[PDB]
Design a protein around this nucleic acid. Sequence first.
DNA 1: TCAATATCCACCTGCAGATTCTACCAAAAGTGTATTTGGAAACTGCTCCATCAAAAGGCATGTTCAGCTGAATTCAGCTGAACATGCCTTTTGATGGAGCAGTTTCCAAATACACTTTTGGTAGAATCTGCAGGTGGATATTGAT
DNA 2: ATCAATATCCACCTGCAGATTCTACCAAAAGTGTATTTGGAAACTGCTCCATCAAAAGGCATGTTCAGCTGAATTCAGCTGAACATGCCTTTTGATGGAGCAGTTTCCAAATACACTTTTGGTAGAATCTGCAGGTGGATATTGA
Lengths: 104, 106, 92, 95, 99, 97, 84, 78
Amino acid sequence: KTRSSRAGLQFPVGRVHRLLRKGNYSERVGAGAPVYLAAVLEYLTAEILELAGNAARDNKKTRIIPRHLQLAIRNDEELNKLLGRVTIAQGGVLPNIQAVLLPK
Amino acid sequence: KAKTRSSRAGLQFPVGRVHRLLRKGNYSERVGAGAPVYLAAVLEYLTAEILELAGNAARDNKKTRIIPRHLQLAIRNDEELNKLLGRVTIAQGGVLPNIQAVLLPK
Amino acid sequence: RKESYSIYVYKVLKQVHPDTGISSKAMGIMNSFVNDIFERIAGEASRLAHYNKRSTITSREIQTAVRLLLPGELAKHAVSEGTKAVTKYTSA
Amino acid sequence: KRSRKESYSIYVYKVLKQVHPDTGISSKAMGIMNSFVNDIFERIAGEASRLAHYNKRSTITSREIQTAVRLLLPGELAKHAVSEGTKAVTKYTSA
Amino acid sequence: KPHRYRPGTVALREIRRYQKSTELLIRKLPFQRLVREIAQDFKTDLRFQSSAVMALQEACEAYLVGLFEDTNLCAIHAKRVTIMPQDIQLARRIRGERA
Amino acid sequence: PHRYRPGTVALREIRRYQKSTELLIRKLPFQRLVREIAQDFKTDLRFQSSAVMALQEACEAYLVGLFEDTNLCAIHAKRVTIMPQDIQLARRIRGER
Amino acid sequence: HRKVLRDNIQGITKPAIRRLARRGGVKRISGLIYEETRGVLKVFLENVIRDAVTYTEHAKRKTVTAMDVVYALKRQGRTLYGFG
Amino acid sequence: NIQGITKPAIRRLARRGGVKRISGLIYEETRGVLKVFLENVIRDAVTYTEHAKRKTVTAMDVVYALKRQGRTLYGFGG
DNA sequence: TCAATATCCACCTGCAGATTCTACCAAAAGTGTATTTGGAAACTGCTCCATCAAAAGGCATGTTCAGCTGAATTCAGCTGAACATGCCTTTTGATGGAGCAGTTTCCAAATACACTTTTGGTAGAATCTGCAGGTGGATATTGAT
DNA sequence: ATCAATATCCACCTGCAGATTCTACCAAAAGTGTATTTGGAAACTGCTCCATCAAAAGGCATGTTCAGCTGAATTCAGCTGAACATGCCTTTTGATGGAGCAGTTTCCAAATACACTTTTGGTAGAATCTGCAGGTGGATATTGA
Ligand SMILES: [Cl-]
Ligand SMILES: [Cl-]
Ligand SMILES: [Cl-]
Ligand SMILES: [Mn+2]
Ligand SMILES: [Mn+2]
Ligand SMILES: [Mn+2]
Ligand SMILES: [Mn+2]
Ligand SMILES: [Mn+2]
Ligand SMILES: [Mn+2]
Ligand SMILES: [Mn+2]
Ligand SMILES: [Mn+2]
Ligand SMILES: [Mn+2]
Ligand SMILES: [Mn+2]
Ligand SMILES: [Mn+2]
Ligand SMILES: [Mn+2]
């Protein structure tokens, strides 16, 4: 009987709500703002985790690590764009070497 | 007699308003009495720094009324302010004249 | 005590990859992520409402907010999921 | 139907006349001055808010505002900004 | 004579010229249509506070004027005095406008 | 006696380091540098071990990135060697100075 | 029932561009620059008009205010002084 | 001390950067940039520190710092 | 095209640093209940946006023509890359030993609320006034010779 | 080095937009109690930090050669810039009509504000694992002849 389950979500709807209130964003918080926001967070979360899981499988590992999250982010136009100004610590860079530098 | 907090503070800027803008800005639940005093103080100061500089630009242009061009000239010629307003763009301020040396004739 | 999204992150992980696990350090990044975005949406959300002289951040705000933050296509699902997750909640 | 709109003009002016009594600001220029005034009131108010949040502190006191000013304003303006603001405060609190 | 100014003598004259001024260099009306043309292809049946189109033009030129400076720098760093597309691209590429 | 052409081990090191993710600067030296720099801001400070890690991650990540842009610039200058003039422009356009 | 708007991107004439370039302190200009510039402009514009029209739409209005543009320019990171 | 940051290490970073040949003057140039990077981040961190009346720089301070430098970092301070 | 030299790439193998588990106490996170109030509807008031309507030049446009710039070679130095050679600062693993971040109590000193009482700031209406926008003559700047 | 062909300048010069004073009201800002909390003192802990070994161990620092790589000349179309000639199509005041942006009230569905219960999510110990990183060997790739 928790809104999170009522809204059919794995994320803490109730919490998002409290956080929206504590955070000092407005005086009053709509009842749907949490559920909504909560959803969006969860969704983006899955998107990442999914590609990151994949990133790991093709790497032969069963456990997702930072690099994995990095390789998953930088390889997606959408995400790369999104977190274009964020650095995943311990994620290194994508393997890329300018053509002009390769031997003839 | 009623006292303007600004006067009690020795300022031209509206302390009474700064305080109000803080409350209605959802910056935090409560607001100290000094917050406004101190904020308005900095605002007014900076304002003075720009104007002092701006106004000069004006004079060097033989003009007596400060105009955007002047505001720009003043701001871009002072590291401090230009750093501060580095991402800010002044409508009608044109650019600081500057021509790469390599571009000039022999 | 210190709250965190670790749990929910995991619960979500075991849904797309019930098989895949997740490094501790990696789990840290996932939190940083959720907070950052929570922050971003919530910001524009308030910011926006404030622009409209209104005193309450509703799902309306959050949605538009998402539309200003998320990349054209990434924003759709973000949006669909939002509307969906609400109607469901608000119905039952 | 007064539909009143606030501003800082009045003050931008007073101060102008304070440094350069002779000169006067135009209009489009005054317009820019407000933008500036507001732009920093927020940069500062924000930081102040963000700061206060990190410390689980309930209110934004002059302290906050200062550190804000310190984080925001570069080197010199920062120094002069503070003294000026600190000073002005204690005068207000001098009863 | 007739009297022709060496190629580039004017170009320079023109820099010192426009850097000295502040008006908009793109024509009003032609520009306004692009706004309305673009705007239109998003939300239909839109209106425009005149000053809004100005905010945009002020914004655009100021952008282009600035972009061009970086570009000119790239050209020069390329031992060229002529800006070319590759210059605009490296500039944006570095600026982080897009990768 | 076997030797590789100049630039061969170089391309290898690239392929190699672009793959690895471990920090590339020695932690001790770094930590020392941090505390020193920091000491000019407030005396007798303590650093959370993790706070220094953040700094190094951030720092290295930064340089790694700055080098990338630098290369593009150097290459733009039709070179294969990165010089100071490159880091400079890159920074400049980046609006860091 | 006003006319169909099209190709207006050419409003940004060749002359108009070189003037911008000059203020940018550019001396010599390759023939390609022009079209490349037009493109770069459309993209810049698009993005700001998009975000702007969004603030409008969200405010349940049919008119784009200067503010809409100002807020748009600001979140894009091109804070403009002079209208808002 | 900034010299603590050695050639090889500087060499490697560039390498991860995709740089092949490296001019010798670079190293010195790199130190400067590197030093400024820190000066700025720390200067700020230490401030978030001092404000919280602490004598210890927390990773969170560093985070909140790298965040206003526009250098957002994921992984520390939760 | 041989030919070594080294550099990768693989398919195990397993010891060890972390991942699930496990078993539980408090802040949140739900539940009614009792106000409260934001702002979604009408309903205008009337501001300012979209549209002509004509003329004026101020500027695009398209065309010559050829200065001089961007590209293409060549070519040495000179400068970095590639390598052993030999120390020597990092790295690690474990301790103690103070510092601190962090908690509780405690409790004035501040800050929120309300209740009205002023008076300063914001429209519009008059009352000025800096400054285009125009015109000459030094003064300079270019560029042919 | 001279000198004719054009740009700049730099005052001088009034009639207007636009500014800069005038009034005139309200919407704040100020004032005066009350009621509700911060969040700054003092002790008081129990985690991390720090300072100390020290143990070899991988890295750095260092000179040697040299392969390229970079920075210098030297041409050489043509592709830009400078100038014209010819018109188009922006500007530019001038009206309106009338789509909306704003005010102003109502009034209700939706938000607080309160206790008053349940439920869940952070610890502080257990119970397994996914890999690191070390083998061998097979090619593979990089380089002399
Ligand atoms: Cl809502
Ligand atoms: Cl205060
Ligand atoms: Cl090109
Ligand atoms: Mn003065
Ligand atoms: Mn109401
Ligand atoms: Mn020819
Ligand atoms: Mn050339
Ligand atoms: Mn102690
Ligand atoms: Mn009065
Ligand atoms: Mn004039
Ligand atoms: Mn040779
Ligand atoms: Mn024509
Ligand atoms: Mn109507
Ligand atoms: Mn449980
Ligand atoms: Mn392995």
